[PDB]
Write a protein that binds this ligand. Structure first.
Ligand SMILES: *[C@@H]1O[C@H](CO)[C@@H](O)[C@H](O)[C@H]1NC(C)=O
Lengths: 50, 49, 50, 50
């Protein structure tokens, strides 16, 4: 009910180092692909945790 | 034998660590993949090397 | 064994089949039937049904 | 209990609903509304909307 929001901006996003940080099976994405996250690149990232 | 994060890497049309430098599958692949947990036979408390 | 479920070892066996272009060597269990000619029948030749 | 994770017992309940052709008998908590006629309204009759 009080989930935490964090803004990610002005840095270099390496998505290949997420996997060895938490024990999760699937990096479930909807509009993009998890293996192609380094070639394309974005404007801003929002991280919500609960 | 791989780890649990890379089980999704054994698929045609994937990139990463296993699918790029260890084991690459063709795009016209016709076959099956069977992956099962081995926490008892392939694991040691001091670390499997 | 103290790791999470996303870092357990996983045994992987990949069965890659070659499709029927050569004479067949490995085949599944099916009972053969004597050949008939000059009659409209249903044939199953090496997995090819017609 | 010493067997693997794929040989464990699994309890299965299959809920098969048969579609509405007879008068409907089993369905849940949707509050009914009084019926008005001779007006373009949005109707919900036994689950079908229009
Ligand atoms: C979890 O994050 C902490 C942050 O201090 C780090 O020390 C630790 O190594 C991380 N866990 C793993 C498995 O990388």
């Amino acid at each position: 009910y009080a989930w935490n929001r964090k803004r990610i901006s002005n840095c270099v996003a390496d998505y290949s180092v997420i996997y060895n940080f938490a024990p999760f099976f699937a990096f479930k994405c909807y509009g993009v692909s998890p293996t192609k996250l380094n070639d394309l690149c974005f404007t801003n990232v929002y991280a919500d945790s609960f | 034998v791989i780890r649990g994060n890379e089980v999704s890497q054994i698929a045609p049309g994937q990139t990463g660590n296993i699918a790029d430098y260890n084991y690459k599958l063709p795009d016209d692949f016709t076959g099956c993949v069977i992956a099962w947990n081995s926490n008892k036979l392939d694991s040691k408390p001091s670390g499997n090397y | 064994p103290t790791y999470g479920v996303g870092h357990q070892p996983y045994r992987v066996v990949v069965l890659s089949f070659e499709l029927l272009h050569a004479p067949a060597t490995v085949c599944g269990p099916k009972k053969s039937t004597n050949l008939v000619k000059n009659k409209c029948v249903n044939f199953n030749f090496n997995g090819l049904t017609g």
